[PDB]
Symmetry: C3
Amino acid sequence: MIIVYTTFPDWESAEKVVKTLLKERLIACANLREHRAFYWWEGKIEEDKEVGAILKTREDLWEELKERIKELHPYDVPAIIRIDVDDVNEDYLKWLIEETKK
Amino acid sequence: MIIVYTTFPDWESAEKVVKTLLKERLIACANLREHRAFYWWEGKIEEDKEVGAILKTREDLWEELKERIKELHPYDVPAIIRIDVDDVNEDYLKWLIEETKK
Amino acid sequence: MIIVYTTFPDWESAEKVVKTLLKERLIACANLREHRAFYWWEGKIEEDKEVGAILKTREDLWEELKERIKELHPYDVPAIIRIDVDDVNEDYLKWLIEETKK
Ligand SMILES: [Cu+2]
Ligand SMILES: [Cu+2]
Ligand SMILES: [Cu+2]
């Protein structure tokens, strides 16, 4: 399995996108929590309050999921970050496979 | 070293389990923070408020730790997710080894 | 690209350090959020409220970034944890490369 991390400008977009991804059976679950982001914009350090999203899905769904996030994301240039899971308890993995599209 | 991520239904269970794992010297530390989870239950998108837990330990303790989490977890099917750490500052790694069981 | 995770004792140190790292062009962005940490200190389970920081940068900047965090960190023994990113959308990766030092 894999984790995918992305960030959203607030809760309405984060929840809309995550619920669409669940409906499309591209993810098994999402964990959403606020953070404060700091980055460069035009020679200045910018802050933005955001909602980060930790998504859990199968490896084989990565490219499809990445494309759908690109298509749904409120940001022109979103972060869509895949981190592979090195091991997981089998009962959870079985559930995640059951809950994702075939 | 490794990270292990799991989620709990609230703070009392999260803290009880993490403190037991510390007492058993199976982890060196835990970072706990709230999130909102979205997933499928019986044809419906369900939300649950949870406490996520980021645990830090040695690679060689993974199987023992995974079994103990299974045995302590309030969920029938918990997420117990191992992500390997590709590098870490040595002083921290030494501390983590010192603080975990031998 | 890589993620680097570290923790700070509160927001002032976290923001000062992250903004210095941005100014030095060692990271492209940071996501900061509170957590509660549990760990061993002198035979007792200790808790501390902290700010965790998720940093995003290039692989080739890891050693320089790790040294700078050591030099800036309020902790004697900070956690400075590198997790490699297995894949990312190209538009984001291009932006991250553009925003980091050359
Ligand atoms: Cu905002
Ligand atoms: Cu709940
Ligand atoms: Cu504190």
